[PDB]
């Protein structure tokens, strides 16, 4: 005959719940709730925020929905017909997560000898073939056909050592300082990820408008996690049943006004605020009204899969400061996470920080199906046929204090099914010279692995403008570019790339055979 003890008594009464209708089991569970107010791991994507993001996605609100693309205009990247790192032969690769070489303070796409430079993950569809390649075009050239491939940064290789996403900026001497994810799969095929850096020197043959990779120097591991702020591989190994995600990837370089250099990356929380059964009882993870939190608590407890996911979810967007050894960096300081999602999601990807005026904007991509709340993300699949989103936050300070945009953190939401040609992911905001209140959203279009059909390859999406509002909101704009345009200027807009959600329109968001096809 247990009795409610402490703050939870007040919670139950506030919620209009009849205390005598509670079982002993329910009372015992309620008595385990910890009402501590102390935030342990930065700004949180709470259970309520997640529910709101999913709900907003289902609403397909023009403010946040990814614009429809003209499906008939989407092509595989010509520069993706290229030597493959794992075969040494010319093959038709697909291309996904990509990033421009950009100025570290402003994020502006860098002009290197009249060229723009982009590094991206490419490989053969349905092969474990994860390596990074250098692509280049004349600076400001909007023609997707003009991009060329300088080849894989690290030359030929195998799945034992992979390269996943990062960022890149120029050194004073004209070399590229590349930040990337080195992945070692030698321990029972696990994706053992580490933040790495290398210096890339280029050869330019002016008359052939041809760039090649000349030297790759100083390749080394920068950060693997500290164990307190961020989970280490050894920590992950200790407890993994198969249900725990590994993350130490997607490093985004940014410099502050004083020239200090930071990497903002995807990880998981360490012992500062670790995953586990205890997370279900931390009231601060819920983030709704007390009454809604109470409903959520019982929902998690009553659903075995949700409960399991809640125990393992601890995605974080971390930050470290580097020392001043630009070409051979070491870690100078490890900070608490900027954002974390204990209890809520075990995957938040591709973080991107842009300084606009005197404020820092942090965006990240996520697939809501990696969230703990199955009921919420399953509903997004039912409504739209996909569950992708971009989330966003703003701070007056680079290393802490982030506030969610559009209340919940929602910024972009999926608008077409995941297996359509015009599905997108890996949103990456790029600042726009001469427009300090807008960002150009780049992404890849078509999901990997021929899910949209044989020959339909992941390729660079048409880019679109996002309006940033000083009142901590954002608005998708009806302004779109050619595929693979990283630089918004006065020749960038191409309204022909815009689509409509109509079966038989020439600019349909669906290719023939997709409208009404199973997801
Ligand atoms: O390719 C690595 C690169 O992709 C990112 C997201 O852009 O991680 C994505 C991720 O999932 C992709 O691949 C899985 C197949 O297992 C698929 O289910 C999903 O639809 C894809 O987005 O890639 C790794 C390995 O597959 C997963 O850990 C991760 O979920 C980015 O963070 C990373 O640099
Ligand atoms: Ca986890």
Give the whole-angstrom CA distance, residue 216 versus residue 201. 6
In the reported structure, the alpha carbon of residue 342 is separated from the centroid of ligand 2 by a whole-number distance in angstroms of 8
In the reported structure, the alpha carbon of residue 24 is separated from the centroid of ligand 1 by a whole-number distance in angstroms of 43
In the reported structure, the alpha carbon of residue 338 is separated from the centroid of ligand 1 by a whole-number distance in angstroms of 21
Strands 43-44, 339-340: pairing is: parallel
Give the whole-angstrom CA distance, residue 475 versus residue 466. 6
* Cβ proximity of 157 and 123 under 8 Å: no
* Cβ proximity of 390 and 354 under 8 Å: no
- Closest residue by Cα to atom 2, ligand 1, is 164
244 in contact with ligand 1, CB cutoff 6 A:
no
In the reported structure, the alpha carbon of residue 223 is separated from the centroid of ligand 1 by a whole-number distance in angstroms of 20
Measure the CA angle with vertex 476, ends 473 and 477; round to 5°: 125
Show the domains of the chain with their CATH numbers: 1-484 (2.115.10.20)
User: What is the three-state SS of 308-324?
Assistant: HHHHHCCEEEEEEEECC
Q: Gap positions in the chain, given as the residue before each gap (C–N > 2.5 A)?
A: none
252 in contact with ligand 1, CB cutoff 6 A:
no
Q: Name the token pair of 295.
A: 């409903």
CA atoms 135, 125, 371, 462: torsion sign: positive
Give the whole-angstrom CA distance, residue 322 versus residue 350. 19
- The bound ligand whose nearest atom lies closest to the alpha carbon of 122 is 1
Cα 200 to Cα 175, 179, 384: the distances in Å are 6, 11, 42
- Closest residue by Cα to atom 13, ligand 1, is 448
Nearest to 66 by CA among 506, 468, 464, 474: 464
Surrounding residues of ion ligand 2, Cβ less than 5 A: 244, 268, 275, 312, 314, 346
* Cβ proximity of 222 and 248 under 8 Å: no
Give the whole-angstrom CA distance, residue 214 versus residue 34. 57
350 Cα nearest atom in ligand 1: 32
* Cβ proximity of 252 and 167 under 8 Å: yes
| DSSP assignment of 99-122 | EEBB-TTT-PBP-BTTEEEEEEEE
Spatial neighbors of 462 by CB under 8 A, at least 6 apart, are: 69, 73, 445, 480, 481, 482, 483, 485, 494, 497
Number of H helices, E strands in the chain: 7, 26
* Cβ proximity of 284 and 39 under 8 Å: yes
| 8-state DSSP, 212 | E
Nearest to 397 by CA among 319, 496, 512: 319
DSSP helix/strand/coil, 253: strand
Q: Which residues are catalytic?
A: 97, 349
- The bound ligand whose nearest atom lies closest to the alpha carbon of 185 is 1
246 Cα nearest atom in ligand 1: 28
In the reported structure, the alpha carbon of residue 122 is separated from the centroid of ligand 1 by a whole-number distance in angstroms of 13
Q: Do the annotations mark residue 249 as ligand-binding?
A: yes
Residue recorded with tokens 């999602």 = 341
Cα 86 to Cα 93, 161, 179, 181: the distances in Å are 11, 11, 21, 18
Spatial neighbors of 336 by CB under 8 A, at least 6 apart, are: 40, 41, 42, 229, 272, 400
DSSP helix/strand/coil, 403: strand
* Cβ proximity of 267 and 222 under 8 Å: no
Q: Distance between terminal CA atoms of the chain?
A: 50
Name the experimental technique.
X-ray
426 in contact with ligand 1, CB cutoff 6 A:
yes
| 8-state DSSP, 41 | S
130 Cα nearest atom in ligand 1: 1
Q: Name the token pair of 94.
A: 């697909």
């Amino acid at each position: 005959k247990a009795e409610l003890k402490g703050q939870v008594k007040d919670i139950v009464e506030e919620s209009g719940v009849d205390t005598s209708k509670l079982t002993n089991d329910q009372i015992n569970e309620l008595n385990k709730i910890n009402f501590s107010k102390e935030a342990k791991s930065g700004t949180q994507l709470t259970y309520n925020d997640f529910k709101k993001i999913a709900k907003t996605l289902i609403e397909q609100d023009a403010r946040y929905a990814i614009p429809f693309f003209n499906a008939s205009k989407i092509k595989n990247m010509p520069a993706a017909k290229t030597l493959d790192a794992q075969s040494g032969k010319v093959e038709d690769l697909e291309i996904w997560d990509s990033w421009p070489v950009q100025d570290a303070k402003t994020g502006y796409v860098s002009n290197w000898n009249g060229y723009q430079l982009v590094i991206g993950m490419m490989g053969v569809p349905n092969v474990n073939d994860n390596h990074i390649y250098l692509l280049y075009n004349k600076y400001g050239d909007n023609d997707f056909n003009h991009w060329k491939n300088a080849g894989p940064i690290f030359g030929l290789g195998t799945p034992v050592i992979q390269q996943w996403s990062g960022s890149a900026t120029l050194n004073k001497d004209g070399s590229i300082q590349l930040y990337y994810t080195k992945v070692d799969t030698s321990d029972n095929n696990t994706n053992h990820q580490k933040l790495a850096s290398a210096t890339v020197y280029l050869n330019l043959e002016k008359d052939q408008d041809k760039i090649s990779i000349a030297h790759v120097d100083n390749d080394h591991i920068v950060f693997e996690g500290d164990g307190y702020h961020y989970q280490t591989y050894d920590q992950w190994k200790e407890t993994n049943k198969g249900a725990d995600n590994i993350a130490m990837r997607d490093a985004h370089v940014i410099d502050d006004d004083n020239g200090n250099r930071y990497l903002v990356f995807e990880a998981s929380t360490g012992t500062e605020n670790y995953q586990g059964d205890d997370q279900i009882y931390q009231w601060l993870n819920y983030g709704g009204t007390n009454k809604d939190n109470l409903g959520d608590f019982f929902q998690i407890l009553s659903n075995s899969d949700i409960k399991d996911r809640a125990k393992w979810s601890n995605a974080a967007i971390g930050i470290i400061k580097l020392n001043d050894d630009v070409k051979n960096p070491s870690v100078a300081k490890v900070y608490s996470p900027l954002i974390s999602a204990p209890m809520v999601s075990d995957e938040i990807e591709r973080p991107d920080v842009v300084k606009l005026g005197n404020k820092y904007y942090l965006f990240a991509a996520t697939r809501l199906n990696r969230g703990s709340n199955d009921d919420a993300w399953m509903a997004t699949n039912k409504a739209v046929g996909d569950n992708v989103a971009m989330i966003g936050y703003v701070s007056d300070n680079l290393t802490h204090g982030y506030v969610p945009l559009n209340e919940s953190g929602v910024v972009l939401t999926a608008s077409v099914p995941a297996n359509w040609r015009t599905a997108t992911y890996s949103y990456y905001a790029v600042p726009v010279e001469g427009r300090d209140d807008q960002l150009l959203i780049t992404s890849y279009i078509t999901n990997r692995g021929e899910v949209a059909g044989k020959g339909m390859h992941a390729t660079w999406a048409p880019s679109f403008l996002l309006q940033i509002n000083p009142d901590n909101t954002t608005t998708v704009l009806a302004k779109m570019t050619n595929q693979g345009d990283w630089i918004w200027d006065d020749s960038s807009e191409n309204p022909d790339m815009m689509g409509v959600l109509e079966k038989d329109a020439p600019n349909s968001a669906a290719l023939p055979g997709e409208w009404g096809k199973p997801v």
